[PDB]
Amino acid sequence: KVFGRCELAAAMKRHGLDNYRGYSLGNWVCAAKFESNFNTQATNRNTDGSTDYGILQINSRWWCNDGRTPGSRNLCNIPCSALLSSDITASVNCAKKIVSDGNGMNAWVAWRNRCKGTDVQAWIRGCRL
Numbered sequence: 535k536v537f538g539r540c541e542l543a544a545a546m547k548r549h550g551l552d553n554y555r556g557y558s559l560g561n562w563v564c565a566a567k568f569e570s571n572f573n574t575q576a577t578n579r580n581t582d583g584s585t586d587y588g589i590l591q592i593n594s595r596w597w598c599n600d601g602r603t604p605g606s607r608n609l610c611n612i613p614c615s616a617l618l619s620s621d622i623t624a625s626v627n628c629a630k631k632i633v634s635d636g637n638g639m640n641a642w643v644a645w646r647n648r649c650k651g652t653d654v655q656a657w658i659r660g661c662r663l
């Protein structure tokens with residue numbers, strides 16, 4: 535799908551991301567533009583061999599099953615193709631766990647450097663929320 539500046543993000547809040555498990559949900563919306571650029575079908579492989587999926591940009595190596603990830607924990611226990619559709623309603627369970635390791639955003643590559651210390655309230659701001 536193609537989601538605009540004010541239309542793909544009001545749904546983080548419909549899923550409990552608001553201020554959940556210590557990260558403020560204000561801090562969240564910026565990074566999305568940095569991982570798949572508001573696209574729920576944009577995916578790529580990893581130069582280390584495990585492909586990634588979604589706006590989420592996650593690989594089947596440590597987290598889900600795509601069948602090409604051996605030595606994969608499949609900690610998500612769901613097909614990786616189970617998130618890339620227009621609908622995204624159940625795709626957050628695993629996202630809701632990825633911060634539980636205590637690693638935080640240790641997984642999101644763009645945020646720690648593109649959205650870490652940025653004017654992020656300048657990212658979620660302006661839409662009605």
Ligand SMILES: CC(=O)N[C@@H]1[C@@H](O)[C@H](O[C@@H]2O[C@H](CO)[C@@H](O[C@@H]3O[C@H](CO)[C@@H](O[C@@H]4O[C@H](CO)[C@@H](O)[C@H](O)[C@H]4NC(C)=O)[C@H](O)[C@H]3NC(C)=O)[C@H](O)[C@H]2NC(C)=O)[C@@H](CO)O[C@H]1O
Pocket residue numbers: 577578579580585586587590591592593596635636637640641642643
């Ligand atoms: C191309 C695209 O679309 N996406 C690419 C991504 O594939 C890639 O992303 C990151 O991939 C790395 C590789 O695994 C991953 O980092 C490691 O994540 C694990 C678990 O999530 C962490 O391990 C836990 O450590 C804790 C703390 O010490 C331990 O308690 C625990 O024992 C560990 N877990 C288990 C179950 O053993 C690591 O801490 C972490 N790396 C380090 C060095 O700490 C990220 O999760 C991936 N994130 C995403 C969103 O992909 C990215 C690489 O930069 O490239 C993208 O392009």
